[PDB]
Amino acid sequence: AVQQNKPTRSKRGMRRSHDALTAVTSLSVDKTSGEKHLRHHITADGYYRGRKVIA
Template identity: 55%
Template sequence: MAVQKSKPTRSKRGMRRSHDKLSVPMLSQDKFSKEIHIRHCMTKKFFYHGKLILKKNTN
């Protein structure tokens, strides 16, 4: 097992942890259905950029 040579400084610890924060997802509103959705993702009703991209199978 590797053993560290010296204690990591507060600065290095802070640099390592700097990317651990949570970010708020970017939300958009669809042009046609007016639904709120995550950017670059389809809505719950399967719209993307105002176009229906998936049809539900009603079998």
């Protein structure tokens, strides 16, 4: 337990280098409607692979 003496801005930074989260960069396009969504996920309106799923 307990730090003997405080770490720096640098160390604190060096630890956080990996905390940066990645983007999706992989948006789909629905065949019929042409709406953007995640791969293997349904659309906002309710489509999946050019067919109506949920009203």
